[PDB]
């Protein structure tokens, strides 16, 4: 399904598994490092050892996670980059 990532207090990659996101609090993103499941808003505060503590972070809202989680850079252009992009928009638009 979805190859996902974020660059918050470090960076992290994961797997969005659409079929599991069936409630605002449903851990549906799985870290591609610890392999654990994360609810979209907790996944955004989960970087692995990537730290980034000598830079001041302004406006980080965990609730603003729909602006943080992005589609992997794994550009296979064609209509998969667009198809999966449209499915990522659907995930975002659902419990708001």
């Amino acid at each position: 399904h979805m190859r996902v990532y974020h660059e918050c207090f470090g960076k992290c990659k994961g797997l969005l598994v659409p079929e599991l996101y069936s409630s605002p609090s449903a851990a549906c993103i799985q870290c591609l490092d610890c392999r654990l499941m994360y609810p979209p808003h907790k996944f955004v505060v989960h970087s692995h050892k990537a730290l980034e503590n000598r830079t001041c972070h302004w406006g980080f809202d965990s609730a603003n996670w729909r602006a943080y989680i992005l589609l992997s850079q794994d550009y296979t252009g064609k209509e998969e980059q667009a198809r999966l992009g449209r499915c990522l928009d659907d995930v975002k638009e659902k419990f708001d």
Partner: protein, 195 residues
Amino acid sequence: APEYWCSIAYFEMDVQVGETFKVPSSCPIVTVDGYVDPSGGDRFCLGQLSNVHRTEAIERARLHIGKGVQLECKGEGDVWVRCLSDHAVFVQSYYLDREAGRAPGDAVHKIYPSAYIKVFDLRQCHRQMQQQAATAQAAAAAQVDDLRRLCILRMSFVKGWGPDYPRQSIKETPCWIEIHLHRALQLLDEVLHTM
């Protein structure tokens, strides 16, 4: 008084790309992005700017500065930044340096996507500007550009720079802009005449 409230100069690494874009007072908000409009009234578009020195690696960063930032002037000359990009924007401002809690120019501020932060206060600038001015006045012995750093904003578009990153100075980032607030620049030219 200021015909324009600020003028913006774009850079890719240490080369200035395009002509310095001047923002008119009739325009409080201005957008800096990477798309179409090769002209620009309240839109400084970077997507159609040439640069012989541009490298494939720089082109890659330009594709990520999507909707870019929005620079907003409030009141007499206070500035705010709105990150419309999918990627955070890194700013350099003495205002934040303080508000944050750190020493003068000793912090890089990561402004997150969709965030809307105030990055410059005119008064705090005018006060602080008089301070260091009189401070230098006090250098007695016997037998100025340091002041315009306070009236300036530097911000990087997709790549941070500092202790936490592979880049030492903003001039190593693929695409950033330098902002001269004119109103604050006047006060500078006033704190000296009036001094």
